Each structure stands twice: as structure tokens, then as C-alpha cells.
Amino acid sequence: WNGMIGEVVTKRAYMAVGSLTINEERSEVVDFSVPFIETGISVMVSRSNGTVSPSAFLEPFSADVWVMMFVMLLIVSAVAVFVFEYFSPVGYNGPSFTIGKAIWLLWGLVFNNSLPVQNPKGTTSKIMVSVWAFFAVIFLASYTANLAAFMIQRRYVDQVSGLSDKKFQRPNDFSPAFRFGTVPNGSTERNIRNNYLEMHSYMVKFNQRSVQDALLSLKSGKLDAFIYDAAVLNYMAGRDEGCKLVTIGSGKVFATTGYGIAIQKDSGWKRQVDLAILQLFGDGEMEELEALWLTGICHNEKNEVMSSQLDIDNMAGVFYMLAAAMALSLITFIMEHLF
Amino acid sequence: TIGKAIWLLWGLVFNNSLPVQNPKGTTSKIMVSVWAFFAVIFLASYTA
Amino acid sequence: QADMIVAPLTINNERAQYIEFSKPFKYQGLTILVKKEIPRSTLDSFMQ
Amino acid sequence: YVRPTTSDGTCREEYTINGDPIKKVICNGPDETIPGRPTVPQCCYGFCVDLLIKLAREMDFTYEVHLVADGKFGTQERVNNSNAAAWNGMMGELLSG
Amino acid sequence: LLNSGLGEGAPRSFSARILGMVWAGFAMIIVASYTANLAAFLVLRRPEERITGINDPRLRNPSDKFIYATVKQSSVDIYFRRQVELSTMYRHMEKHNYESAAEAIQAVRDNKLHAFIWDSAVLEFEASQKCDLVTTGELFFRSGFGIGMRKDSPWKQEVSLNILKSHENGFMEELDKTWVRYQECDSRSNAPATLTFENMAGVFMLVAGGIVAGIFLIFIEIA
Amino acid sequence: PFQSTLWLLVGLSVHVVAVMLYLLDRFSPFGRFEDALTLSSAMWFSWRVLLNSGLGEGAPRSFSARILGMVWAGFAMIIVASYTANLAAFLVLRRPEERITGINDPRLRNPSDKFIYATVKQSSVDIYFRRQVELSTMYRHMEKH
Numbered sequence: 001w002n003g004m005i006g007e008v009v010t011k012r013a014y015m016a017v018g019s020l021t022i023n024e025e026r027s028e029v030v031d032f033s034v035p036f037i038e039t040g041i042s043v044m045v046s047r048s049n050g051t052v053s054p055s056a057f058l059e060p061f062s063a064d065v066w067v068m069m070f071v072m073l074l075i076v077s078a079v080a081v082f083v084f085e086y087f088s089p090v091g092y093n094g095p096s097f098t099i100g101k102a103i104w105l106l107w108g109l110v111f112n113n114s115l116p117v118q119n120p121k122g123t124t125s126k127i128m129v130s131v132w133a134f135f136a137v138i139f140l141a142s143y144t145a146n147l148a149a150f151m152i153q154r155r156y157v158d159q160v161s162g163l164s165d166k167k168f169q170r171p172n173d174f175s176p177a178f179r180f181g182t183v184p185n186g187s188t189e190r191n192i193r194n195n196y197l198e199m200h201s202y203m204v205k206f207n208q209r210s211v212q213d214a215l216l217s218l219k220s221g222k223l224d225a226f227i228y229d230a231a232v233l234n235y236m237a238g239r240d241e242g243c244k245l246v247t248i249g250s251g252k253v254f255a256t257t258g259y260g261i262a263i264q265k266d267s268g269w270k271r272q273v274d275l276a277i278l279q280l281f282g283d284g285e286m287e288e289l290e291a292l293w294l295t296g297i298c299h300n301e302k303n304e305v306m307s308s309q310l311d312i313d314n315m316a317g318v319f320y321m322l323a324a325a326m327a328l329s330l331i332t333f334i335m336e337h338l339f
Numbered sequence: 340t341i342g343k344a345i346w347l348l349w350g351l352v353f354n355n356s357l358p359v360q361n362p363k364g365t366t367s368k369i370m371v372s373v374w375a376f377f378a379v380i381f382l383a384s385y386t387a
Numbered sequence: 388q389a390d391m392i393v394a395p396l397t398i399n400n401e402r403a404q405y406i407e408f409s410k411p412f413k414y415q416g417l418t419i420l421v422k423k424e425i426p427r428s429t430l431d432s433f434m435q
Numbered sequence: 436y437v438r439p440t441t442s443d444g445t446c447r448e449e450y451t452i453n454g455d456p457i458k459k460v461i462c463n464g465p466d467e468t469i470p471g472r473p474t475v476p477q478c479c480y481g482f483c484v485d486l487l488i489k490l491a492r493e494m495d496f497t498y499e500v501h502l503v504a505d506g507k508f509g510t511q512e513r514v515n516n517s518n519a520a521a522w523n524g525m526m527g528e529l530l531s532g
Numbered sequence: 533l534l535n536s537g538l539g540e541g542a543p544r545s546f547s548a549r550i551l552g553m554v555w556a557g558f559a560m561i562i563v564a565s566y567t568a569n570l571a572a573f574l575v576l577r578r579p580e581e582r583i584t585g586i587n588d589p590r591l592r593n594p595s596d597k598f599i600y601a602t603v604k605q606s607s608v609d610i611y612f613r614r615q616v617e618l619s620t621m622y623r624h625m626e627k628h629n630y631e632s633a634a635e636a637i638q639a640v641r642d643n644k645l646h647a648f649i650w651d652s653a654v655l656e657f658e659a660s661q662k663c664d665l666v667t668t669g670e671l672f673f674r675s676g677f678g679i680g681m682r683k684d685s686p687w688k689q690e691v692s693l694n695i696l697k698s699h700e701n702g703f704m705e706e707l708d709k710t711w712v713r714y715q716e717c718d719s720r721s722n723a724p725a726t727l728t729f730e731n732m733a734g735v736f737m738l739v740a741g742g743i744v745a746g747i748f749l750i751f752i753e754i755a
Numbered sequence: 756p757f758q759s760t761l762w763l764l765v766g767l768s769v770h771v772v773a774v775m776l777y778l779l780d781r782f783s784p785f786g787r788f789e790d791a792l793t794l795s796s797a798m799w800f801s802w803r804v805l806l807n808s809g810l811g812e813g814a815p816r817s818f819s820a821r822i823l824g825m826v827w828a829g830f831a832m833i834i835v836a837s838y839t840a841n842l843a844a845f846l847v848l849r850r851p852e853e854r855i856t857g858i859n860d861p862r863l864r865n866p867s868d869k870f871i872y873a874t875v876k877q878s879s880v881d882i883y884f885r886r887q888v889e890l891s892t893m894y895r896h897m898e899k900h
């Protein structure tokens with residue numbers, strides 16, 4: 001072992017501070033005590049795995065507006081056809097001709113006029129067209145207001161319930177490039193090295209140097225993911241110039257640790273020193289120093305992300321449903337041609 | 340054609356309302372389609 | 388009859404002044420939020 | 436508000452945007468364009484001027500307004516000026532002469 | 533007005549043309565105002581009856597009608613005893629408190645108490661289990677929960693190494709992963725389209741009333 | 756907010772429906788003249804249901820064009836209602852994406868060389884920053900320049 005910790009072995013440093021996370025190596029070569037602040041290993045970018053946001057058009061339906069619309073179409077078509085469309089005792093093709101035109105008339109009234117088709121003669125049917133048109137404009141107003149109100153809500157990349165995903169085992173999964181790394185010669189290199197051999201062997205080819213180079217790489221577009229300490233990510237992401245990138249979630253990180261001190265031989269104060277830390281929580285200095293030195297710039301409740309519109313992936317899905325209806329109409333055309 | 344044209348355009352601006360009729364030339368149908376697109380865009384910007 | 392406590396107890400100077408304690412495994416704070424209520428109507432027959 | 440005297444007479448007479456005559460007083464002040472500090476007779480008018488006119492008409496007395504130049508910080512004797520003593524000549528700023 | 537379509541002619545007179553133009557404009561005004569009030573109802577202003585953040589100003593001021601009853605005889609009394617800052621509230625919050633946790637958690641949900649002062653440790657479990665409460669975002673007055681042993685016990689270093697190795701391999705991620713169930717609600721205004729069917733049914737019953745009224749109309753017609 | 760390839764796909768769907776209306780009913784092969792009949796009429800139907808137009812001469816009798824016109828009108832309502840929702844979301848323009856804080860800006864206590872908080876030199880602000888004792892570490896930074 002070498003570095004600054006050797007100063008504790010050479011009897012040239014009775015006590016030392018800094019970024020010293022408690023773990024087995026520091027507690028193995030020398031002694032330890034209680035950390036004053038907590039931290040851990042975290043990712044600079046959010047937990048999304050490059051997943052595309054889902055569609056927001058079929059979400060308000062939830063397989064309910066189409067089913068209830070079909071049932072209402074059946075009862076409205078039936079009760080609407082057994083009142084004035086069936087006046088004389090006819091055969092089976094009689095009411096069917098009024099049903100085929102009635103469903104197209106109602107469909108024309110739902111989707112905002114579209115096709116006037118025609119109009120009957122009875123005034124009660126005209127009143128029914130007026131009421132159905134009122135339900136059509138009310139359903140349209142509630143559809144545009146509900147869809148817009150749902151669009152104003154949070155629809156950005158949502159966090160997933162998977163920490164160790166495909167990028168922690170096999171590197172050849174994602175076809176587009178996705179670079180990720182950390183600063184060598186540290187606790188993260190030995191922890192990830194002892195926990196994930198593939199991530200280390202695939203990570204040594206992408207190494208950093210400092211923090212400004214990583215910020216320039218993430219700002220330009222050279223680096224994709226960045227994994228480092230939680231405190232450096234809170235101060236780095238906190239002191240941002242545009243408040244674009246954000247950490248994973250809002251404070252839920254793995255591997256809980258903290259920055260502590262290291263002494264040579266347990267013979268002086270030590271214990272009382274720990275009580276000194278216990279005095280800090282008794283004086284409220286953690287809030288003043290936390291809001292004074294540990295603070296940043298982007299501290300305006302980072303919980304919602306909104307911008308412009310992503311890959312019409314939703315309209316592409318609606319187009320896929322239109323292709324499914326096209327195939328259904330093709331099979332229907334085959335069944336019609338077979339007869 | 341002006342008296343019916345202004346009423347047709349007024350019908351297209353306020354969302355169909357009355358279909359009235361439609362001529363035969365395809366250029367008038369294309370211009371009516373563009374006027375309907377600008378009409379529903381103006382309606383969307385008006386409601387928003 | 389007690390040798391070691393597995394309950395997540397707090398760490399203070401009055402308690403740790405006469406006994407040795409280990410490092411905490413989870414740092415959590417105190418909150419004052421109880422519950423929230425969202426006002427809405429279930430029937431919703433407009434004209435309100 | 437300090438405004439230079441137009442032509443070679445007294446102040447410029449005007450009105451406000453609500454229908455009320457504005458009063459101006461005579462005030463001698465320097466100029467920032469010329470490197471020197473000459474006695475430039477100008478006309479002052481504003482909130483403190485109207486307040487000075489009100490306090491001047493509510494009490495039977497005469498006054499004379501004058502513009503102050505540079506030196507608006509109490510004059511803190513901190514620059515080493517020859518290794519000698521000093522004396523308070525500002526701070527409050529009211530007793531010059 | 534109701535936007536209907538037949539197709540049999542058009543008003544040739546200019547008076548009915550201008551009247552129909554201003555009438556269609558009035559229809560667009562009332563439907564655009566109705567839709568605007570619908571969107572204004574969706575969002576809601578609500579942004580009221582919320583909390584403060586790291587320190588609620590209502591805690592420093594004493595209140596008789598809104599008692600902040602907390603857990604009696606616990607770590608909160610030691611925290612309120614070893615402090616010096618909030619000393620004008622320990623006398624008010626010292627009296628009228630419950631010495632049981634289930635009585636307080638059951639009291640704040642069974643309409644009894646106004647509020648409670650307790651850590652989010654049990655709050656996140658009872659809120660993530662009973663689906664009746666919700667936690668906040670900030671965590672003011674942070675504390676640590678450790679294990680205390682005797683000073684003459686040499687096993688504290690071995691157990692400490694077992695805790696460190698237990699947090700280095702990933703066993704804590706399995707415990708917290710299998711003991712923290714992420715259940716549904718996260719904010720008071722995050723999903724405004726989870727109902728819909730009731731809001732549409734409340735008008736559907738009026739549509740059925742219009743169908744019965746239509747049966748009355750055809751009853752007048754056949755008469 | 757959306758690339759031109761999306762509208763190109765919308766027009767591509769118009770071509771798919773246009774050739775679909777000709778593929779359904781039987782007619783004759785026609786690359787002989789300039790203007791057709793069922794092709795121009797089918798295009799007038801596609802632009803009639805998509806952009807919501809209205810003529811009055813009849814109605815499609817076949818059920819295939821009925822279902823295709825129903826799902827096509829539904830797609831039109833989806834794109835115009837979704838586009839309206841994108842317009843309202845564009846006019847929401849909610850994003851103060853900026854601010855000072857309130858009674859005490861945390862950026863004032865933290866020193867910064869790229870955003871200098873210059874003030875009036877030699878005035879009452881120097882006396883206020885001199886008689887204080889709280890924010891004393893910033894008097895050296897704000898004292899110069």
C-alpha cells in the first residue's frame with residue numbers, strides 16, 4: 001500500500017481528513033472512527049438505460065373508452081333502431097340496412113361531422129342526432145382537455161426498478177455506442193473490480209482524469225454515463241450552468257458510506273473526538289454548513305422534466321394500430337371474396 | 340359565388356357547422372382543404 | 388440479560404458517553420408530513 | 436434632478452403629464468465632461484427639492500441649496516499617508532463649514 | 533349551435549348569413565370557454581394546504597386547537613432535551629402525548645390527532661404498506677442508527693467487519709430490495725386520468741334520461 | 756418539435772388508403788390518359804375524411820371503406836387532438852428555469868469569479884458591509900472591482 005495512507009504508517013500524520021469512505025481496506029491497513037457525512041457510489045446521469053418514453057395516446061383509454069364506446073354503440077344502435085327505423089314488419093335484411101347506415105352516421109357524428117352522409121325524415125331522429133352531437137362535442141372537449149392535461153404532467157424518462165441491468169454483465173447488447181467509465185486509482189475501481197470483472201475489463205479502456213474533463217465530456221457528447229461518488233455528483237450536478245443533467249432519482253443511492261478520519265494508534269482522545277461529532281448534531285451546524293458549503297445552484301425541487309416532443313414513437317404506435325386494422329380489413333376482404 | 344363562398348368559408352372556420360355544398364373543380368377542393376387545415380389550426384390556437 | 392441490541396436506536400452523546408457504538412448503516416431524518424387529500428367529484432354532472 | 440440652464444436666462448418652464456406646474460430651484464454644480472470642477476449654475480428639481488420647498492414654506496426662514504461633489508463614504512483613514520496622525524473630518528458629513 | 537349536419541340547402545338571405553356567422557362564433561366562444569374551464573379544472577390551483585420544507589414555522593408558534601402530539605417517552609424526547617434552539621416548544625409539546633406507536637399511527641389515521649413528530653423510517657413502511665399515507669422529499673434533522681456493544685467486547689470489530697462485508701457484496705441491496713415495495717401514488721397531482729369512466733358515466737345517465745325523454749316525445753308524437 | 760419524416764409518414768398513410776380504396780372495389784387498369792376517376796375520387800375521399808371537408812353526393816356503401824373511414828377519421832381526431840395538446844403544452848411555457856431565491860441568495864455566500872456581484876464603490880453599502888460580522892468572508896471578494 002502507498003499514497004497518503006502511508007503517512008499514517010510512517011508516523012508523520014496523526015490524523016487526516018478528506019474523501020475517505022469507510023470500507024475494509026481503510027479499516028484493514030489502519031484504524032477508523034465514525035463518519036460525519038454519508039455518501040456512496042452513484043451514476044451522474046439518471047436511471048433510464050436509454051429507454052424511449054412510452055405512448056401517451058392510448059393511456060387515457062386503458063381498454064375502457066373503446067369497450068364502453070362499443071357497448072354504448074350497441075345499446076344506442078338497438079334502442080335507436082327499434083323506435084322509428086322499424087315501422088313495417090319486414091324480413092331480416094330490413095333492419096340490417098338501417099343498422100349499417102346508423103353505425104356510420106353515429107361514427108360520423110362522433111369524429112366531428114367528417115361526412116354528412118344523409119338525414120332521415122322524423123324529427124325525433126333529428127333530436128337524437130342533436131343529443132348524440134352534444135355528447136360528441138362534450139366527449140371531444142373532455143378528450144382534448146384530458147389528453148392535454150395528461151401531456152402537461154410528467155411524461156419524461158421514468159426511473160426503472162433495476163440497478164444492475166444489462167450494462168453490468170455483457171457489453172455487446174446495445175448496438176449504438178454507450179461509453180462509461182470512472183477515475184482510476186480509487187475506491188470505485190477496486191470495488192467495481194472486485195464486484196464486476198466484466199465491467200472493470202470493459203471500463204479500463206474508458207478512464208477519466210479530473211472533474212472538469214468529465215463535465216466537458218458530458219456537456220459536448222463524448223461520454224454517456226459517469227459513475228463516481230455521491231458527494232462529487234451532488235456538488236457537480238448542483239453547480240450546473242443550465243440544470244440539465246440530474247442524478248438517479250432524488251437521493252436514493254446504493255452502497256451507503258461516509259467520509260471519516262484516520263488515526264495512527266488508539267491512545268489519545270479518539271472517543272471524545274467522536275463525541276465532538278455528536279456535538280455537531282447538538283448545535284445545528286449540519287444545516288448551516290450543509291446550506292453553505294454543501295449547497296449548489298440547481299436546488300429548485302428537481303422532480304419534473306419537460307421540454308419539446310420526442311420521437312413520434314406514439315404516433316408510430318398509432319400507425320401500427322392502423323396497420324393492424326388494415327390487416328383486419330384485408331382478412332375481412334378475403335372472407336368477403338370467399339363467399 | 341361570393342355570397343356562397345363567404346358562407347362556405349365561414350362554415351369551415353367554425354368547424355363544419357353547415358356543409359352547404361361543394362363545386363366540381365379539384366383546385367377548389369384543395370383550397371377548401373387548406374382552408375380547413377388553417378381553420379382547425381386557428382381553432383386549436385384559439386382554444387389553447 | 389442484554390448483550391447487543393438489533394433495534395435501530397438513535398446515537399447521541401448522552402447514550403454514547405458511557406458505552407461504545409458502531410457506525411450507522413442507514414442515515415435517515417425526521418419528517419412531519421401526515422397525509423394529503425385531493426378534492427374531486429365522482430359523479431361530475433357539469434354545471435358546477 | 437439636475438438640468439443645465441437653457442440659453443442665458445433662468446430655468447426651463449414646463450408642466451407634468453397630469454396638469455400640474457413643476458417648480459425648479461437654482462443650484463450650482465460641477466460638470467463631469469470637463470476634467471476640472473467649474474461652478475456650473477444649473478436648476479434642480481425633484482422629490483427632495485419639492486420637500487425642501489414644503490419645509491421652506493411651512494417655516495419662516497431662508498435657505499440655500501448646494502450640490503456636493505465626490506466623497507460619499509465617510510472618508511475612512513486607511514491609506515498610509517506619510518506616517519502621521521489624522522482627525523475625523525467626515526463620517527457624519529454635516530460639519531465642514 | 534350543437535354542430536349538426538343534414539344537407540338540403542343554405543340560407544340565401546344575408547341577414548340569416550350574418551346571424552348564422554355571429555351565432556356560430558358565439559358557439560365557438562361558449563365551447564372554447566367550456567373547454568378552457570375544463571382544462572382549468574383539470575390542473576386545479578390546488579397548490580395549497582402544503583408543507584414548508586426543512587422547518588415548519590407553525591412548529592415554533594404554540595397552538596391549542598392544533599396539538600402536535602408525538603410519541604411519549606422515546607428518542608424524540610431525548611432529541612428535544614439535548615437541544616437548545618427550539619426550547620420554547622418543549623413545554624407545550626411535552627404534555628398530552630401518547631406512549632404507544634400503534635396508538636399514534638392509528639390515531640392520526642382514525643381522525644383523532646392533528647399531526648405527529650416521528651422519523652420517516654416507520655412512516656415509509658406504514659405508508660408503503662397500508663397505502664394511506666405519503667412521505668415528503670426533504671429529510672431535515674438527519675440521524676444515524678447504529679449498533680452499540682460493550683467496551684470490553686472484542687467481537688465488535690468482527691461484527692463490524694461482517695457489516696462492512698455485508699454492505700460491500702450487495703446483501704443490503706437484497707434486503708432493501710425485498711423489503712421496500714414501490715406502491716403507486718407519489719404526488720397529489722401526478723395522474724389526473726385514472727377515473728374518466730365515472731366523469732363520463734355522470735353524463736351518460738343524463739343521456740339515458742334524454743332517451744326516456746325521447747320516449748316521452750314519441751309518446752306525444754303517436755298521440 | 757417533430758421531424759418532417761413524421762408528416763411524410765402521414766402522407767404515406769394517405770397513399771396507402773388511396774391505393775387501398777382502389778384495391779378493394781374492382782375497376783380497370785388505367786395508365787392511358789392523364790386524369791382518372793376512381794383515383795381522384797378516392798383521393799378526394801381521403802382528403803375529405805382526413806382534413807374534415809364536406810361535399811354531398813353520396814356515401815360509401817361497402818363496409819370495408821366504412822371501417823377504413825372510421826379508423827381513418829379516428830386517426831385524424833388523434834393527430835388533431837394530439838397536435839392541439841402539443842400546442843397547449845407549447846403555450847404552457849411553464850419553466851421559470853431561473854430565479855434569485857428570496858431574502859438571501861445562496862450564490863452570494865459562495866465566491867465565484869465568473870459571476871461577479873459588483874456594487875457601488877465607496878457608499879453606504881460599504882458601511883453596511885463593514886459594520887456587519889455575519890457575511891465577512893465576502894467583503895474581500897466584493898471589495899475589489
Ligand SMILES: N[C@@H](CCC(=O)O)C(=O)O
Binds near residue numbers: 019020021186188
Ligand atoms: N473517496 C474516493 C474518491 C471518490 C469516489 O469514491 O469516487 C477515493 O479516495 O478514492
